[PDB]
Amino acid sequence: MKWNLDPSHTSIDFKVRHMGIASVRGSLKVLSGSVETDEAGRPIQVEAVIDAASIATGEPQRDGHLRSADFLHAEQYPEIRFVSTQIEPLGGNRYRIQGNLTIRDITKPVTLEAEVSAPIKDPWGMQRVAASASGQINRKDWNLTWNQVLELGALLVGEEVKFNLEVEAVAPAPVA
């Protein structure tokens, strides 16, 4: 069965190390996505489209820099895209999702560790299901570089981008 991601209750949150002593946190908004489940209700395929211009870290000048031609170039590349290539059930509600993540013109493999909830009938007719997932990427894999950075050799802006997803997905009534 096909579930559609609800952009209003899906969150993408990320963290990057700053000067080795702290983290900068940010978010991205999802535009759309879906999950297909097999007869057993295990997720088999998942895809999402993310609004690149939505990147937000709570400082407008920094967010401008992130969106600029110097970094994400969100005017030329309005989306970040994820498409799964393999989903492995791990037991219980756990799944490992391998997929391809596109940022600008570069696509690289990423791994998500996901946990899925039991579906509910929501207060408005629809079937609704949630999931949480975690992972990390190295921004340099997408040629997203930063600076002349110097501290001891250390980094102003870390290479690793840790992220957490909270997802809600929906399907029509007992009838699709």
Ligand SMILES: CC(C)=CCC/C(C)=C/CC/C(C)=C/CC/C(C)=C/CC/C(C)=C/CC/C(C)=C/CC/C(C)=C/CC/C(C)=C/COP(=O)(O)OP(=O)(O)O
């Ligand atoms: C059944 C069911 C519901 C199943 C569900 C399945 C499921 C889990 C589906 C999920 C669908 C989705 C949404 C999948 C998404 C997949 C993935 C991997 C998404 C990843 C998104 C992501 C994190 C993209 C990140 C891109 C980047 C490059 C972020 C970069 C952040 C960055 C470098 C920030 C700057 C931070 C540093 C510290 C700046 C310092 O600031 P400052 O000192 O002021 O400097 P300046 O001002 O100069 O900028």
